[model samples]
Target: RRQLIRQLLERDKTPLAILFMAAVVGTLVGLAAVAFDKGVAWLQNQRMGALVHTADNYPLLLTVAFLCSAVLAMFGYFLVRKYAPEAGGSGIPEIEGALEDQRPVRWWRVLPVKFFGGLGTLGGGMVLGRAGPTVQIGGNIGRMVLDIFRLKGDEARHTLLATGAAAGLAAAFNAPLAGILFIIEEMRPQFRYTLISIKAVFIGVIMSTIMYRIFNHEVALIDVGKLSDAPLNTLWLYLILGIIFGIFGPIFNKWVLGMQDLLHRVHGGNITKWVLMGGAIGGLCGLLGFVAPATSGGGFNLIPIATAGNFSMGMLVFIFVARVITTLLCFSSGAPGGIFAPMLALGTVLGTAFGMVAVELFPQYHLEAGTFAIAGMGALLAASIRAPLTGIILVLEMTDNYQLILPMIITGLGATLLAQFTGGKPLYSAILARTLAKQEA
Candidate 1:
């Protein structure tokens, strides 16, 4: 046994060791992300349950909802204000910053702040998603693991952080393959893409998928379920849609940054102003939740509803505009929330609206609007993020409409190419550049 031990110790570490550690990180990240989702769900249920019970006795459901959401949002705002400001918003850009050494990864502060703060803001029905916080926390966890193991290699640090971030995204959406693709496609510039590292990412995704399946079952994240295919004859329409999104994408990015500047100027970096504005926005969202729930909160629930053809063209357009404003306001205000889900929601609304109009104009085609819905799912993502692969994989995973993969790819490519031609930069990259500029200043 001693001889065998000595021989093992003397042997050079193989690629398998890296895979094993990736699996370990993936499992932990998956479990943690799933737990975070459930935690947010539990909080939502508690607040809703209490409001439902009291709603019958008092006609103040809106008021109660406002108070509940306001208080919850304040908690999130306070956490970010008092601790790590970088933990605010979809933390993907922050992760990108960290990978490039432009930002510090304070895992100790980030983990707890993002976890509990995400739970509060998301649970409060703000227009946000959990994946952003999940990815950030996952990346921080990777750093934490590195610190605990005392592994000081630059390669190890970079690879593990990317792995953790991928695993977190996989767990958040229950989309393992997309998670791997996201790291490769989105972080291609900063990520070290060696053969060994790619294998590690694969192992990490696999482990995360297993854990996520254990908690959430194997159901697709969003069940749009088998939409009819886009025919070759009608492919031109999808391209036109992509071009439209391409024009909007850069404008959207500008609006997001512009709103951030507006908010900063209004608040002037005052903590009280920031918190009060957050509370007011949260309260308004709460009030809107009762009157027009579709217009408030992250748009995950709105996607299935919009795609199901329940709303008329005019109504859909109105909802799309309202949501665009709300999404921009909430995310740009620097709340501890994610714009990922809201952006998808916006894409769905606009795509559906366009589809409905197209069907009216092209009556002979007998086209399925849902096909456009699927295409739109990735178009905006491609245009704004400038990462077509990540956008394509994300939509594929969320909807599981693999049959529409070709159209999705075509649409995403069209959008991204046109957006680039129009001189639009990637959204997260722009945010990171702004952060770095601030640091330098």
Candidate 2:
């Protein structure tokens, strides 16, 4: 009788309340993303600006750059090590774990830790993206709302968590539709796809996008200028590009996992050693950022230039190889960073290189290399995560090249198929599986 009464009360009030709370979560996540973005930008400028002033004194510039990034990275590592070890790495796997009740959401600890910690690591010139941390932060904020409202039942908890995650991805890239698609597609297995839950996800994405536009402009995250579309004849070139990433993707994942294991062995679960190792990696990234700006940082700023054909084919390959190493090192070292943007960067350079070569091979087609670059942007994503839909939509939105959807889709599909054929697991799921194994053991 008591259970029936409680159900009656929930039916009457929960639906409307949950929708309203979704809006609240979206708005808060947008504000947090704005704050996190601004903080990272400010820190990067401070470090770079200081180095610029000392540029004439080569030794001073090098010393200042290395030490600044090292210290900043150490700060992030210390916080993660001391307060919330789960705050380390991409944080996406942790959220994935949380979604299924396999992991706990300590929002109060995570929110501040990830925000400031992301500021330090990203600002320190480590190759990382804001999207992963933003997603984790958004999910945590959802839980926070759940606690504040004292909402009961697993259904309400699950819906809000997903709503915030969708909002976070939207705000991170200012891509509202892609944000909604990510939760529905990339997180399909974990996300509970109920009518109300899907509705909540939409509401959250819309509200967060509105707030994001208010704080940041609605320009595409990447600007490669208007480029010619891929012709029917040139479509095969994109498939070849996809095949390259298809082969590269699994190897990249293997290297990343291998590096993670190596780093763990070196650190031996010691917090001080972990923090110092992270600092050293950050310092190396700082030095690399100074020497070869294209090879360091999150790679967003380099994408447009890379796609614009600024580098020769040889130079593009060099940058791609260099960044692959840096990305592998920085991400695998257990820092509070993400792989999305770095992967995007890696994809762009190599894609552009392929296009450049194809242009020479097929003089009659008059193909645009940037279009290939755009298509390739999502190929690695599809290959690695097997989220072809999300990858396609995200690239379209980020570059605003809707005309090239066919090529993007082709590339995404090709990459996904080949990666699957190679028996490669999705990167985030692999990480989550490792975490679960550790937990169970």
Candidate 3:
């Protein structure tokens, strides 16, 4: 009975209400994302900087690092366990589930939990990205507005959800175009194509982007300094790189899910066990941050260095393999972290390694491996997310690599094709299916 009433209210929304709400969602989410980013930095500088210095003193800095990270992660895990279990992990799956109407909005609970809890986990040197949490946060903010304004209509609620999420993505990555593509491509399952809805999305993205620029001054999230354009003859190298990611994509996805299942088996439904496991991983990340930061945090730091040919092929491979393990451990442990940035790092590392190897093998082409780095940057995402266009656009937008669009496009398409050909499902949807299975069982 209550569902019917909610549905009727969601059926129609006035243009003014939608615009007003869209602007609100964008600004709020944008500000929220900026605060979240700065908050993490402040915590990291204060916590990790001291912890590293503590390493030079008595009692072993590692212990303090472990303690600092453990306590932070425990609080984050506790928030999810005590209030909203759906807030655990990255929360993108939660948004996807809500889009399917298979999950409750619970915005009042999600909003505070994800924001504060994300601070706890993300601040603790974990390899999480802000993208997932922000997107989840944005959607919850949407629901909160719908309820607050007493908006009665499905389109209104749905459009606002998309609006806030798009805005959030823009703020998170400093990539407005990618934010818009995020909805039209990545969450197409949950988004409507209504003319009214798109206007809201545009408004939301524009507003949030403006807010982001005010705080950030319009900086590219990952700057590779605009590498020389690859000649058409060398374009085939990106195809080869794409094939590598295509094959690796399914394997990587399997590893991600396998780790999630492994953690579930390890901890089961025990809150104590789950939270404790998260703490241990958190501690490990703290240690890594001090000793080897390349393998720590969200992988954002690794991009420019990796793309600049700073690391040797062997070193790149080492970091690639190490981060794969940490990324899986941190993300699959149900921490309030995101794999988006980590995945980007992984792609960059391996891609650059491939580029170096290609240079060695095909010395005749005078190929710049960094060019391949741009192409390979989005290949894994294309294959894993099954959104070739999003991956392609996202890389170009994030890295200022517009000149490599052809290679990126070819790489993205090839990866998606190969990923699909091997029956690899999109990561989020597959994860969502698993969540549904658990719910049903």
Candidate 4:
């Protein structure tokens, strides 16, 4: 038995321990994701409960809403500034940096900071997604396991980190295949794809997904219901929509980076000013929730509503524009959340709006605008992240719109092509590059 174990650890032979540890990482990450998700939801509900208490009194309700969100967001900012600055922002960039060995994991610092800080900021009605924090947390968990087991091999470090990240994405969206694809496609540059590594990723995602299902029911994240398939002749319209997103995608990335620069300039590395600015943004977002409920928070709830074609064309456009600004404010301010849900919501709005117009213009085709809504949901992601496969698979899993696969592929390809033509850097890569520059300075 001792000899067999020794042989198993040899270079040529597979490391069985790696797979076992991966299962551990996946299980733990799954629990962490569930806790994070439930924690954020609980905090948000508490804030809403406070507002409900003052519902009859307009002024008091507004005051409570503003104060609660402001204080919560300030807590997040203060934690990030004082404990782990890397915990701020979407945090996906930090993971990418770690994978490339450009940054340290600091799991002890990052895990707690990102988890609680995410609860604070995301709970405060900020336009941020949970996936980013979850992914960071997942990766940190992987590193934590590695250190505990005293595994010092480069392959162990690299494989576990990537495994945890894939599990995080899987747990976040309940899309196991998309989670694997995200690591394979989106993190391709940084990920080391070895035979053992790929299998470990598979195991981690599977375990996390099982854990996710245990807590949350087995259901699609977004319930858009089934929609009519796209007609063969009407496919060109999706191409047009993709082209629109391609143009919009790069500009969106520019604005996101630009907003970060502007906010950094305003804070000037002063924690006081940074926290205060975060509070103000949070307060405004809270207030905006009352004014335009669709524009605030992560926008997950808004996706299905928008896809249902409930809003008029003008109203859909208004929501899309409003969300873009809010997403910019919360994300670019270095809040500890994600851009995924917000971007997906934005896509739904514009896609649905486009579908509405298309139906009117092409009455003979019997088109369903909701189908376009589904296609556009992932197209923007493809354009911005330059991961068409991940985006397409993610939306397909989330919305259960497999019938529109061709349209999705067309839209995703079109968006990616256009985004490349415009020379837009991938959003997370751009952010990571800036972070590295700051580190060297």
lDDT per prediction?
0.82, 0.87, 0.84, 0.88
**Winner on lDDT (1 vs 3):** 3
lDDT tens readout by residue for model 3, 1-441: 999999798864448878888999898888888899898888787786777576576458878877788888888888988898898887777777776668788988878888888898899989888989999998888778888988877778778888888888888988888888888887746444443377788788888889888988846678899788878788787887888888889989999999988988878979999899888999888878877888888888878988889898888988999999999998888888788878888888888998898889998888777887788888888888777887788888888878889989988878998898898989988888899998999
After TM-score superposition, the amount by which residue 130's alpha carbon in candidate 1 deviates from its true location, in angstroms, is: 1.0
Backbone clashes counted, model 1: 0
Per-residue lDDT tens digits for candidate 1, residues 1-441, read: 999999798654435545567778888888889888888888778878867867775557767888888888888888998898999988999988777766889999989999998888888888888878999998898888878877656567777888999998888877788788888888545445432276677778888879888878855558887787767788888888888898889999899989999988867888888988888888778777777888998778878777777778888988988988888878898888788778888888888887888888998879878778888987888889888898788888888788887778887888898899898889988998898998899
Clashing pairs in 4: 129-338
**Deviation of model 1 at 99, angstroms:** 1.3
| Model 3 spans > 4 angstroms off | 1-14, 52-55, 190-196
Q: What shift in Å separates residue 391 of candidate 4 from its native position after superposition?
A: 0.7
Candidates ranked, most accurate by TM-score first: 4, 2, 3, 1
lDDT per residue as tens, model 4, 67-111:
899999999998899999999998888888887888889999999
Which sections of candidate 1 miss by over 4 Å?
Answer: 1-17, 56-59, 190-196
lDDT-better candidate, 1 vs 4: 4
- On TM-score, the stronger of 1 and 2 is 2
